[PDB]
Amino acid sequence: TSALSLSNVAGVFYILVGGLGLAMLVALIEFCYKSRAEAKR
Amino acid sequence: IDFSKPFMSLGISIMIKKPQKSKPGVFSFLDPLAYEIWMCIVFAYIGVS
Numbered sequence A: 001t002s003a004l005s006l007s008n009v010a011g012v013f014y015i016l017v018g019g020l021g022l023a024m025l026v027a028l029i030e031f032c033y034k035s036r037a038e039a040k041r
Numbered sequence B: 001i002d003f004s005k006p007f008m009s010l011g012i013s014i015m016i017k018k019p020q021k022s023k024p025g026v027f028s029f030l031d032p033l034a035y036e037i038w039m040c041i042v043f044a045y046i047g048v049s
């Protein structure tokens, strides 16, 4: 029984970054859409 | 010099002390997780913010 190692949880940290990455995409896609559609008016 | 046949056997050996341990640390509450799992709970917290 040693200290829990990063590898043991190295997977949760990926889903976190991946989620953060998806988050920014979802946001900027709405922005892009909301941006052109506004100028097009 | 002369020697009799041996009266006792032996070999070279290693003696070590028994660190009594039983000496917890002040910040021993951080042992469950390794050091890198705290340097990265603090980099994930800045990220997610």
Ligand SMILES: *C(=O)CCCCCCCCCCCCCCC
Residues within 6 Å of the ligand: A020, A021, A022, A024, A025, A028, A029, A032, A033
């Ligand atoms: C309008 O449609 C433009 C959208 C631009 C989106 C750019 C990508 C979004 C963020 C991705 C972040 C990835 C972080 C991880 C890299 C290893």
